[PDB]
Design a protein around this ligand. Structure first.
Ligand SMILES: *C(=N)N1CC[C@@H](CNC(=O)c2nnc(-c3cccc(C#N)c3)o2)C1
Ligand SMILES: [Zn+2]
Length: 301
């Protein structure tokens, strides 16, 4: 019975159980947590009041690295430590709080980013900006009958086709201000990106949350094709480890996670699992790939 422990869900902690199950599938994050909490074990072991210690022992039990006799784990201690200081924003909350505790080495999700904005009517380039990312949040383009949506299409749109109209072109504005007759062209800007350092744990986020004209939240259920292997050479090799899937609508939905089985070491298992909080069942790669991914966790091979 090669299964992972489950997680209790009293009613509204799916967004965390789904993320935790996925984070336990990235062995380098867990290894970085161990070497980070080594500082607290210098004197005695510090069994407490620390977020990294609470997260590590959860991920170590979920990845079957620590012997667990309870067939279900309870992660409520992680939520209480967060409150004293959407599964995607929780990911950004956890990574930020771990960085504040470290303020050592950067967590394997940390990447570097170089960005530039170019006007679509005169090709004027904005000043180059330097950024960091812990995840690549991608837009989902428009669908079409007989035209399937792929993750690569989303990655190309994210790199050189992302539109932004929070800015205006200085060249087109000076020109339009002339003694003649000049028509105002629609301000269209594209944000051309180029990734610098690729992190060894890659998180890809598909933006499924939209907003109507009256402020009501909308969900895009369109399927995005992805594979267990993802090459990032065209944007400069990653293996899919887990997938966070959101079912239902924005109001009465539910978070679930597909994840790989824990290794029998360093060799990634081909056995996928379906984890809905406390329920853990075996699954096939065909089921994983047929789902509408919300968060994709990869690892550099
Ligand atoms: C888990 N145990 N529960 C309780 C009932 C549901 C209610 N909450 C949601 O359905 C929910 N909350 N946030 C989102 C969300 C945000 C952004 C993007 C997506 C997607 N795809 C979903 O859904 C949760
Ligand atoms: Zn321009």
């Amino acid at each position: 019975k090669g299964l992972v422990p489950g997680l209790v869900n009293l009613g509204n902690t799916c967004f965390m159980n789904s993320l935790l199950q996925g984070l336990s599938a990235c062995p380098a994050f867990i290894r970085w947590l161990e070497e980070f909490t080594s500082q607290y074990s210098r004197d005695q072991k510090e069994p407490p009041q620390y977020l990294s210690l609470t997260l590590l022992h959860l991920l170590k039990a979920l990845s079957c690295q620590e012997v667990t006799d309870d067939e279900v784990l309870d992660a409520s201690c992680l939520l209480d430590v967060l409150r004293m200081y959407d599964a995607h924003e929780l990911f950004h909350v956890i990574t930020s709080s771990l960085e504040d505790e470290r303020d050592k080495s950067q967590h394997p999700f940390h990447g570097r980013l170089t960005s530039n904005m170019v006007c679509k009517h005169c090709e004027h380039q904005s000043p180059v900006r330097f950024d960091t990312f812990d995840s690549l949040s991608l837009s989902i383009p428009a669908a079409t009958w007989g035209h399937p949506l792929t993750l690569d299409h989303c990655l190309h749109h994210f790199i050189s086709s992302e539109s932004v109209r929070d800015v205006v072109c200085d060249n087109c504005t000076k020109i339009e201000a002339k003694g003649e007759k000049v028509e105002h062209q629609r301000t269209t800007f594209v944000k051309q990106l180029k990734l610098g350092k690729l992190p060894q744990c890659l998180c890809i986020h598909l933006q499924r949350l939209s907003w109507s004209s009256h402020g009501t939240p909308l969900k895009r259920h369109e399927h995005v094709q992805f594979n267990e292997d993802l090459s990032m050479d065209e944007y400069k090799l990653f293996r899919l480890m887990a997938v966070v899937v959101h079912h239902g609508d924005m109001h009465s939905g539910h978070f679930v996670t597909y994840r790989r089985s824990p290794p029998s070491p360093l060799s990634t298992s081909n056995q996928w699992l379906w984890v809905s909080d406390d329920t853990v069942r075996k699954a096939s790669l065909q089921e994983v790939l047929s789902s509408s991914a919300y968060l994709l966790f990869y690892e550099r091979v």
